[PDB]
Every structure is written in structure tokens, then in C-alpha cells.
């Protein structure tokens, strides 16, 4: 397909080019700068005193519920992009069907808000 070749192959080419530029910048210091590691240098930073522990412990995420609702809301908005692109050609059902779809969304959003699910645990 021509559209693939003219428009999408440049994306693939530039993905490699931007990757090469980022990699060369990392390797620049890896090759030029002096490397002199010692146990104190490579230890974890906690403001001058040794860390109590590493960062591989459980940690309560007080916004966990909002993150679950983030997944749901992501899919709701996805249905709007083809609708917005097709807006000129929409039929009466196609137009008001979205309004019903968005009204059901707003009932869910009003339920979250009223329940208190948007306040952190």
C-alpha cells in the first residue's frame, strides 16, 4: 500500500534515528568519562545516612481506586474519536445514540462522585 510506504515508513525510520541519537548520548560519557566506582559511591542515597531498607517493599497506593476508574474512562472516550471524525456524516440515530451513551457515562460519573470514590483512601 502506498499510504503505508509514504506515511508510515518514515515513522519507522525516525524511530530508529531518534533511538540512535539517544543511545549515542549515553555512550558518550560511558566511553569518555572516568569510571571509578567504590562501595560508598554506588550505595543508595538517603540524604547522608544509610537507607533503612531498599525500595522493594509493599506501599499503600491511596489512589488505587481512581486508577481502576481511569481504565474504564479511557475506553469511554475512545468511542468518541470515530464519532468526532465522522461528525459530518452522522445520521440522527448516530448523533443521539452518542448522547445516550454519554448520558450513561455521566450517571456512572455522578455515582462515583457521590459515593466518594474520587477521594483518596
Amino acid at each position: 500500500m502506498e499510504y503505508l510506504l509514504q506515511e508510515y515508513l518514515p515513522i519507522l525510520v525516525f524511530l530508529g534515528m531518534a533511538s540512535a541519537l539517544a543511545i549515542v548520548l549515553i555512550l558518550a560519557a560511558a566511553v569518555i568519562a572516568v569510571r571509578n566506582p567504590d562501595p560508598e559511591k554506588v550505595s543508595a542515597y538517603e540524604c547522608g545516612f544509610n537507607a533503612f531498607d531498599d525500595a522493594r517493599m509493599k506501599f499503600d497506593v491511596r489512589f488505587y481506586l481512581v486508577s481502576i476508574l481511569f481504565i474504564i474512562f479511557d475506553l469511554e472516550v475512545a468511542f468518541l474519536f470515530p464519532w468526532a471524525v465522522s461528525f459530518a456524516s452522522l445520521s440522527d440515530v448516530a448523533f443521539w445514540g452518542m448522547m445516550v451513551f454519554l448520558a450513561v457515562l455521566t450517571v456512572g460519573f455522578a455515582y462515583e462522585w457521590k459515593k466518594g470514590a474520587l477521594e483518596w483512601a
Binding site: 569518555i32 572516568v34 571509578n36 567504590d38 560508598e40 559511591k41 550505595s43 542515597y45 540524604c47 547522608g48 545516612f49 544509610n50
Partner: protein, 148 residues
Amino acid sequence: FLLTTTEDIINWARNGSLHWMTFGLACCAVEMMQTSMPRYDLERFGTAPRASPRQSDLMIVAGTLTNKMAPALRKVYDQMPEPRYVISMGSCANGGGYYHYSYSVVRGCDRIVPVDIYVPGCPPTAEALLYGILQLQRRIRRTGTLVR
């Protein structure tokens, strides 16, 4: 020539981008802060503060170093990537100062970390510190290499 002019470029970049750790111990830190404020604007030299030692090239020991604090100062110095430079600012850091004969004070920060410049005063004025930072730049230009 190639290598000396290479070092000159390295010394030029390191002098013009000398980032210092956000680290103030006592009343020498007040004057160090004034050095970055509008009257003097240390940052106009490219000498900007950095919160993390991993991004710091310069440590300014600005204040009294107590025995209890000495391990913490050494640790964050050890976590500076190289090259790293140290300026000793004020009497306490230079030699112990007013607390030289105390039971809880390090009699000079050069007992903990190597020092490049000593700035005298108690405190040095904001301008005196700025002079000391420019003397460090002369020292790097005079002796700077890729190692430091």
C-alpha cells in the same frame, strides 16, 4: 596542539557549568544564600544549585562540621560523581573556628574530605565566597585534566 586544547575545552565546560550541592550547615549558609540572590546572582556564572549529589560537581562546606554530622557529609561527598570539588567556607569549616576546642566539633573539614579552596571569614561575605568560587575556577584552568 590537541590534548592541551582539549583540556582547555573540558576546563571551560566544567568552569562554566559548576553545579553545587544544596548543602548548608550553619550561619555560613546564610551568606552562601545571599550569593545566589539578586545582588550577586551566582547562577549568572552557570553555577547553579543541585539538590542531589549525583548531579553535583561542587560541595561548599558552609558551616560547622560536628562529629555527629561528619559521616553524613562524607557519605554525600562519596556519592558525588567525579570530578568533584570542595570549597571550605568560613572559620568553622576551615579549622574549627569559634568551636575549635569543643568536644563535639571537627577541627576543620579537611579531616573528612579533601579541600580545593579555603574561604576565610566568619562568615565570609557573599562577595568573598564569590571570589573563592572564581579562585577555584582559576585552579581548574591551571591544573584541570579529564580526571579533574
